């Protein structure tokens, strides 16, 4: 995952 | 947004761009009234960043944009950066936005409003279009 | 709130  | 389309200019008038002092867009936000912007807590906004309202084409010099300074950052105290839960920050502007045909506010829901699974909604932004 | 002057086209 990853901060958008 | 991957696999989206270009918006009609001015048709999402609450959409703002958060830019750093170099002019680099790093996050979006939404105007909720002339003095306040809602964004994500994890965007890490500071009072050295700028809110840009009224923008469509970030490559154009001819748009009548508003570059608004930030007075204070209110990161929700329940934000948990380890889980990214409660991911909301409010920005109080130093300079109020001037509302117009291309700059205006989104509505907030009531706490008890229902938005059912399967409802079609819309998202907007200047994020990557391909990874 | 919530009613753009320039209507979006989806």
């Amino acid at each position: 995952s990853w901060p958008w | 947004i991957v696999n989206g389309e270009e918006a009609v200019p001015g048709s999402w008038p609450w959409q703002v761009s958060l830019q750093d002092k170099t002019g680099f867009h790093f996050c979006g936000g939404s105007l909720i009234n002339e003095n306040w912007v809602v964004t994500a807590a994890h965007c890490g906004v500071t009072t050295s960043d700028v809110v840009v309202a009224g923008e469509f084409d970030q490559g154009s010099s001819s748009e009548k944009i508003q570059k608004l300074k930030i007075a204070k950052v209110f990161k929700n105290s329940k934000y948990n950066s380890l889980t990214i839960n409660n991911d909301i920050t409010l920005l109080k502007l130093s300079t109020a936005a001037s509302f117009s045909q291309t700059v205006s506010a989104v509505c907030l829901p009531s706490a008890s409003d229902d938005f059912a699974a399967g409802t079609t909604c819309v998202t907007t932004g200047w994020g990557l279009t391909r990874y | 709130c919530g009613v753009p002057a320039i209507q979006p086209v989806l």
Partner: protein, 95 residues
């Protein structure tokens, strides 16, 4: 990145069904949307997920996180504004 503002329509999911993709990472102050052929992606964070209610666009989500590759078959995760609006109102009222 694009110079010009983009848009996409996409459906809301339930948290229970979103947990098939993301498991225990999904909390009550999150709402999932997408897995429909579009995705929010890096640089969209903080922006709106809006739904029309009684003729007006209403802020339902704030773009938050999702797939590290912005996969269009995986749901994006948004901050759930109904869970947060009391704090918004408390903050505006005090400031």
């Amino acid at each position: 990145t694009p110079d010009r503002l983009q848009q996409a329509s996409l459906p809301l999911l339930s948290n229970t069904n979103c947990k098939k993709y993301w498991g225990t990472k999904i909390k009550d102050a999150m709402i999932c949307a997408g897995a429909s052929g579009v995705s929010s992606c890096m640089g969209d964070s903080g922006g709106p997920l809006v739904c029309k209610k009684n003729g007006a666009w209403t802020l339902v989500g704030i773009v938050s996180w999702g797939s590290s590759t912005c996969s269009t078959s995986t749901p994006g995760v948004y901050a759930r504004v109904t869970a947060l609006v009391n704090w918004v109102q408390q903050t505006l009222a005090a400031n």
